[PDB]
Amino acid sequence: GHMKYPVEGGGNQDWWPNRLNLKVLHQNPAVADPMGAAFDYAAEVATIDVDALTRDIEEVMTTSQPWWPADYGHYGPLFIRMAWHAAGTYRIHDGRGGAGGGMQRFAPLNSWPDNASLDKARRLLWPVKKKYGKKLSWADLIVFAGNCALESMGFKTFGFGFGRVDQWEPDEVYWGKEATWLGDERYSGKRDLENPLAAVQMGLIYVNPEGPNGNPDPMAAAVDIRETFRRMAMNDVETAALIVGGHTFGKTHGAGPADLVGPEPEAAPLEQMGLGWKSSYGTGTGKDAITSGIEVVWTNTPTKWDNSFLEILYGYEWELTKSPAGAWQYTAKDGAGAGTIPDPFGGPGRSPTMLATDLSLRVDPIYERITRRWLEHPEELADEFAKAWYKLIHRDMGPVARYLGPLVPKQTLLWQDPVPAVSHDLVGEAEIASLKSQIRASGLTVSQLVSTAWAAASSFRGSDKRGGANGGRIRLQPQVGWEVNDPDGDLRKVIRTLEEIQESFNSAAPGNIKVSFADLVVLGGCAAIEKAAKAAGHNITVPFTPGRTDASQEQTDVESFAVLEPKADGFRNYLGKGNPLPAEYMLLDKANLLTLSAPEMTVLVGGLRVLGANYKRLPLGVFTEASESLTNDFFVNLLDMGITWEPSPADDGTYQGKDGSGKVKWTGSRVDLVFGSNSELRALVEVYGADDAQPKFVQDFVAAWDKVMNLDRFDVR
Amino acid sequence: GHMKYPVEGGGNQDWWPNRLNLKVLHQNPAVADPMGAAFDYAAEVATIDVDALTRDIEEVMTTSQPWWPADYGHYGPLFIRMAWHAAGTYRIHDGRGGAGGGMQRFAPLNSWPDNASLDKARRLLWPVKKKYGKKLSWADLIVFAGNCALESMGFKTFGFGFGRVDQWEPDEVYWGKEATWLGDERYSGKRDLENPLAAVQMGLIYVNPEGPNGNPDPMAAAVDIRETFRRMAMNDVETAALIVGGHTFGKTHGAGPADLVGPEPEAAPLEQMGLGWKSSYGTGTGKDAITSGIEVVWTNTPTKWDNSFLEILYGYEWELTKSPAGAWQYTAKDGAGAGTIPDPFGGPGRSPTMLATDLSLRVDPIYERITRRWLEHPEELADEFAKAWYKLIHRDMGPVARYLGPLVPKQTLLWQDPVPAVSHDLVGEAEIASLKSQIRASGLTVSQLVSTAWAAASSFRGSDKRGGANGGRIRLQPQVGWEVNDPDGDLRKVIRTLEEIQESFNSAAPGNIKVSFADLVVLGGCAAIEKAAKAAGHNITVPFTPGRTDASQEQTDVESFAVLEPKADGFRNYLGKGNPLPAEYMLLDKANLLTLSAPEMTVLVGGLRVLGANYKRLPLGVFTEASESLTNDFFVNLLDMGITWEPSPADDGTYQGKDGSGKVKWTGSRVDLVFGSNSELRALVEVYGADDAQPKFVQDFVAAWDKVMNLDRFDVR
């Protein structure tokens, strides 16, 4: 090995390969953003002419370009695949992937094997991006083109929301440990796919079109289809509708040997202008195109919505065969259907063909019941595909407040984790002050109030923008039972008291002002922090933004919320079983999901410890002699060289900090000690631990606290 | 190999090992900075009681701490080593390293083998940093503590400048290609050290204390001493003065085997709280301390300034011997000087010892002349050490306007690239506008004016803050003869015409208003940009800040300015011979030294191309039909899929862009085409090439141009 220049990627990871990487807390940094600090994409796309945008995309779709000629004269099918692949990286386990940031245009997604030829697809839409400019993000354009493709070929969609904000660096995501494209080191037990992954091989969207590891067994492939799509939030009906609906259009490409296809875009030479997979087979495009290596045309109407896919699937018997590149596919038996499938460039007709994974829809008993019903009753397919496609393309959009434009449909959807509209006037400054005082007089402790507010708000994750304190779901299943939230039953007492305050305030309230339980949860935390900072000699007011509303249990999909349960929350010194990495790594990952910077994470940990927010009120990291007091004691004591730290003899993830007399003075976890050990984190601790730092600490803590309380408040942004 | 989680360092560099790394353009991002955007270190520094700070440092130096007991009851010598190592990473080829960012507290420098035990040294200063808080950076404190140590032990220093702002992440710098600490793959020929390095092995500051590659030949060691120090801006007299001056104090540490010393700080367990090199030899500290493995005490007065180092060097004869840890060192022959050297902890006196590299001062003919003189003239040694030590610890401070505090002497120093004080009233709005008109009417072309202004300003590098347009040095040696500046070339003509305008304005100007040549060079580029924007149909004003002054040749050290000459400038499409990496990497490297973001680099390239700023007015990348008009044509045409690019058949670093007819329409270099090929840069090009983007492009181009024009203008901020 050799070390490289930083401009060629050399850096400190080379010398200390396992080191904590704080880069995850400064993704998409503002200096790399070419737009002004005042740029507001929502404001820009709110003024776009959707009708003109559609007509322009329709012109692109029927104007073949010589560097990638249009199959059947229509790019729609290619744009549908492009959009499905943009949304198809989404995973429920961390909410990462999806189309919400336009990450398909960056590495590694722009160069995954399964995204072959989408480099040309995205290039075909530059004339639209060029015309609409800052009013249209690549992120929106990529999925809207797929939506327009459907509509122009005869499928009416449920609707569409704009608002995906373009980014300028790829989000770095763990896609698997495999160091070879298409590799597989991600299964254990009886075909247990490693969490958090949602594809069966490195660089695939979901499954292998030739069957598991290339064995074209449709029954076995259905197992992989069902589980990967489950991990992408799709059930059996949704999964079958998406595959049938997608393969109603277009064709696969495998006209010649795959070893004639050159390097992927990130590996390709400069003259290719960001395109990859240059092919020396024939013309390398169009009639000679190679993408997957498979050569299937599912329907006799590749540019039209109808029920041909299932009529063909069930109307023939299927035989294993090979594409011109040598990949497995299926063809109709006994020369049946000869010549009935049209050629993309006017050649002679061909025979019916299907992927092994299409046959899964007929061979798997559950998919068979679903798809045979749609064979007999096609209007049910149209309905389920419209709902599943809408979900797929919007799954990572966050609260519905973020959806913009004239195509947004009004209906509420359970999967959107809906919260009720505001139905009364909101508390003002006087009512907020009164509620603060009442909660402070209620007998709830600073620790209880801060812990509950943090438990509610910190359920948010910035990947797919799910979770948060809006909805008041801390009192509903499953959040009320989460181990980190309610180890001992204390949470139910906090919930009851706040509900009593909600009832007495609302029944006595002036005019038409009413307050939600969800707001009171957050306000309670803000009140306790004002109390604790007063105990520490600081008169501060904690910001509070009203307007959260209270979801019902019936409006809360308990199975869907399961993925939001923390297995680790270093801010509460909580480490459950099953995490992929040691505690300090899980801490930074949590800070990343909360969109926190390193200074924000550092101040939050120090303040939460001394406020008593620790899981089970454990003393780990509680480096203070004061109770219910917002001081910078955590940082001061962390830097005290009078304390000698050793791993606890119990070998239990904890440490003992002894003073000069050999007496144990403090105890701590890996999450606590990492702030005193890591050279970048320790530098932040020395800011907040200095003699002059206590006012800055209180100010920076409150700002970070307020940020977390507001993470999901897109209703006011 | 296995791919890792991003939080453990995984990312796109793993899949494409040689990819351009755009992170070099967002070092120390604002999100990671815990101080406000409003934080103003200069304003905080101005408040510090420097006499109190000196007393507080003196208390630290004389208060031994149990976890690292003080040799001779004084940490002074340790702090001198600390400060000399902080400044000692500096190198002239790229100006990186040095003490100005406090980078010793971060990886990898905090863990270099040569910085062993400085982890404890810095830790000892936390009580001072704790007391002074935001008024005192770690960067200043590390080097001020060394200065204070000299003064406390009897050496009067020349003075001291505060003003080094703390940074919050490591500057990642190429320190060599060796993947093993103390490795050596950096020599070729007889003894040619690869550029840009200024140390003889990976992790060393300058040279090996046991001689080249461990061969304790003092004559060969002097070859390495002279070359590495030269590459750190020190000549023979300065180098001798620094080595004698430092080893006047303290001792080395090698009491036992180095294999009993544990991992360097970045690799050490959490409980060590950021300290490393934990030793199981005896108490592992103090009397049992192991740092280098050498056990030498140079002088009979390790805590006092006097002339004992040279009196001992010349007063004994020296024989080669081994330290207790097995390292080569020298000791007096014939058992001379028994017991004359004191022990750090009251042990028995010991005999005189020296390093191989100390004998170099007596063995090398040039150093022998210099130091034999100081044997009888310690007053000259003191004078030369004061000047060289001041130089060493301020070398990267930039213009003297940055030096803060009450200890900065006013004497001008040639190495500081001085510029005259402003001696007349400065041009105002009326005079600036009149001069712009005169320059626009002078007959100088937009290409000439923009090229010359860029040439002057872009000599700045943010590493050591040398260079820039202040000084008017573009008309002086050596900048007037740099290949990139004056190939043919119009430079002398531009200089002459600007000088005529300066003469004509100054002999007829209002009041006491005089304009400098340096200001006119910059103002000329600003007026040309205004002219080119008008030719495109935009009335704009380019900001301009007067106040540059004109250095004379006698105030310009020609050999010191040699290192500022660009071997590559992608902003002018100039690629000389001898660069370490292909042209697109040298572009990012240049953008980094100009402190530019990726958007700033992008607009500058597109703008300079169409303004005609290319070296030798070559057509590479000049993707426009207009002559000297400020449009976004570069970006529009880069994204034109009607152009097919191929490397030129001449294999000459260039590409041909052909239209549909097969006619060559454009030519470009790697630096041009990388903006169309790299997926992160192409995204920025798509911002500036959209239909709505030309006013944004002009606005951002102007802001980036103004930034480069002002890079060295610390005199006005």
Ligand code: HEM
């Ligand atoms: C088990 C799930 C799936 C598998 C194994 C699969 C596999 C494939 C393969 C191998 C191709 C050929 C790519 C090429 O060579 O050009 C393809 C194309 C395509 N996919 Fe699927 N896919 C799946 C699900 C979906 C879904 C959910 C959609 C959309 C809702 C979709 C829409 C399309 C379309 C429209 C094409 C045609 C592209 C064109 O005409 O250029 N696919 N798919």
Ligand code: HEM
């Ligand atoms: C050829 C150049 C140099 C070489 C080879 C060299 C080598 C060394 C070595 C091996 C040590 C022992 C580290 C340890 O084991 O504790 C040391 C210590 C020291 N160095 Fe030098 N050094 C050089 C230049 C300098 C300079 C230029 C200065 C300051 C102007 C300096 C100041 C010191 C001091 C004060 C110590 C004593 C540290 C203590 O008492 O803890 N050195 N040097």
Ligand code: NA
């Ligand atoms: Na069809």
Ligand code: NA
């Ligand atoms: Na001495």
